[PDB]
Amino acid sequence: PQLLHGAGICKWFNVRMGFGFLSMTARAGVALDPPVDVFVHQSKLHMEGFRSLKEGEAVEFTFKKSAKGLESIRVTGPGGVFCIGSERRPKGGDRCYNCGGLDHHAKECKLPPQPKKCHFCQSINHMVASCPLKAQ
Amino acid sequence: PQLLHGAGICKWFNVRMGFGFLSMTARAGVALDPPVDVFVHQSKLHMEGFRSLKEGEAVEFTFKKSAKGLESIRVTGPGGVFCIGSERRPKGGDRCYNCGGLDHHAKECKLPPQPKKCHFCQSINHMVASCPLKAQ
RNA sequence: GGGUAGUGAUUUUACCCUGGAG
RNA sequence: GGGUAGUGAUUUUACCCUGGAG
Ligand SMILES: [Zn+2]
Ligand SMILES: [Zn+2]
Ligand SMILES: [Zn+2]
Ligand SMILES: [Zn+2]
Structure with missing residues (x-):
């Protein structure tokens, strides 16, 4: 391994x-x-x-x-x-919601839909209104 | 007085x-x-x-x-x-160059042309590339 | 990413909203 | 306001460009 x-x-x-x-x-x-x-x-x-x-x-x-x-x-x-x-x-504050790509947005994303990830830290366990990292 | x-x-x-x-x-x-x-x-x-x-x-x-x-x-x-x-x-960082208004920009500004003022601190004595305040 | 405000005499501000959508 | 990058083993980065124009 x-x-x-x-x-x-x-x-x-x-x-x-x-x-x-x-x-x-x-x-x-x-x-x-x-x-x-x-x-x-x-x-x-x-x-x-x-x-x-x-x-x-x-x-x-x-x-x-x-x-x-x-x-x-x-x-x-x-x-x-x-x-x-x-x-x-x-450009670090203008990422596609789905992939994080700086080139476009989620409506134009051709990748399969991903699980929702935090707008601030990308965690899949919480959302931005409850982001422990942003709360600093 | x-x-x-x-x-x-x-x-x-x-x-x-x-x-x-x-x-x-x-x-x-x-x-x-x-x-x-x-x-x-x-x-x-x-x-x-x-x-x-x-x-x-x-x-x-x-x-x-x-x-x-x-x-x-x-x-x-x-x-x-x-x-x-x-x-x-x-919107504090998107001011007209001539008046500093948040509603528009220098081309559409109708006030008389003003002396050039610093992009960071509005000083009329220097320009942004020589701004003592921004240098912090 | 976005918004709102109001402790008058010496030191850097408090809230809020945002999840298949910008 | 904008840009560029590259010291490989325990702590948060260095430059640059911008003045009758965004
Ligand atoms: Zn995408
Ligand atoms: Zn988070
Ligand atoms: Zn103006
Ligand atoms: Zn200045």
């Missing part, structure tokens, strides 16, 4: 340095409490243009053991959609 | 409390060193909708002696244009 599936949120990310850590709250479908940190490098972020993650954004990902710890292979939003990125990202 | 003309910048303003102070750097056209604080109440701000000032924005105003100190009567931006207001003000 070399390639594992993980889900969580971004713990922290430094845009300039190009890396940070994910907080894995579920490993291969099983809930982790406490969560386990997974290293993330910008090169592995599923996004349009310049890559970064914002603290607290919901992620789904594949990872592996590395000499330095746990390393993520590909990092997406829940259900394989794109990541949100840094609050300072250009 | 009851009504005086003054000019300066906003020292501070608390939007919830509805008051703050102006740093008067010129009284009746004559430069002051040190500047003198002038009280300002939201009721006296020349602006469209909910009133507030942001720290550092350039003002012109009329003022008078009050029991508590100096009180401003009317507060405008340089040359009688509208104030900028709190950074959090709805």
Whole structure:
């Protein structure tokens, strides 16, 4: 078992340095409490243009053991959609509701309809009017 | 001499409390060193909708002696244009270049052409690429 | 993403609305 | 107001462009 599936949120990310850590709250479908940190490098972020993650954004990902710890292979939003990125990202506040794509909107989305995800942090467990992250 | 003309910048303003102070750097056209604080109440701000000032924005105003100190009567931006207001003000970042009105833009502005004022703080002494306030 | 306001004398504001739709 | 990017292992980023025009 070399390639594992993980889900969580971004713990922290430094845009300039190009890396940070994910907080894995579920490993291969099983809930982790406490969560386990997974290293993330910008090169592995599923996004349009310049890559970064914002603290607290919901992620789904594949990872592996590395000499330095746990390393993520590909990092997406829940259900394989794109990541949100840094609050300072250009066009970062005009994403399609379905995929997170900066190019269009949900009425023009040709991808299959996705489960509703938080307008602020992409969580599939809550909605923006109840977003613990936005409440900061 | 009851009504005086003054000019300066906003020292501070608390939007919830509805008051703050102006740093008067010129009284009746004559430069002051040190500047003198002038009280300002939201009721006296020349602006469209909910009133507030942001720290550092350039003002012109009329003022008078009050029991508590100096009180401003009317507060405008340089040359009688509208104030900028709190950074959090709805539509606050989409003002006409000539008057600062929220309703339109410089092409459709019918007021006489005004001296060029900073895009960030409305100063008539500098431009945005050299703004000491934005440089914070 | 969007909205509303009002403690008058020295320091940076409080609410609200938003889920098959912008 | 707008743009560009790239230090791989534990903490929130660096530049730039913009003045009779958006
Ligand atoms: Zn889409
Ligand atoms: Zn959320
Ligand atoms: Zn105008
Ligand atoms: Zn300025």
